[PDB]
């Protein structure tokens, strides 16, 4: 199982999701993202225990990355649902900021509000190795 599960917007976080992931690897972690690991079966399913095998969960918060979870109340979106997986599992949740604006609570649902709780990382495009090295003191 990894240390490591990459959640992220596909459209607009897929290159600074593939990117740390080459750093964590390169630096030992075993890392899960779905291009690379999720493999063959019903893949709600396995998205699902990926999440919960994975120690750390990485959430990718590029512009607009949570849009598509305001107003998902029946949990249908997958970056909504692999949140709400981290978080009702008690995972060290790892937010890494590109470019995003945090909403307010209200906008989102209240099974993923908590994820606006945890202290995250601004990623630095001018200072990527400090960046990364600070990534690595998040992780468990």
Known sequence: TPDVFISYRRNSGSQLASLLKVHL????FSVFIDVEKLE???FEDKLIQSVMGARNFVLVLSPGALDKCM???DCKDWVHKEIVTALSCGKNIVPIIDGFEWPEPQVLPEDMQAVLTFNGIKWSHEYQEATIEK???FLQ
């Open 71 to 73: 107003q998902d109340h």
């Open 40 to 42: 063959a079966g019903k």
């Open 135 to 137: 990534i690595i003191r």
């Open 25 to 28: 690897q390169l630096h030992g």
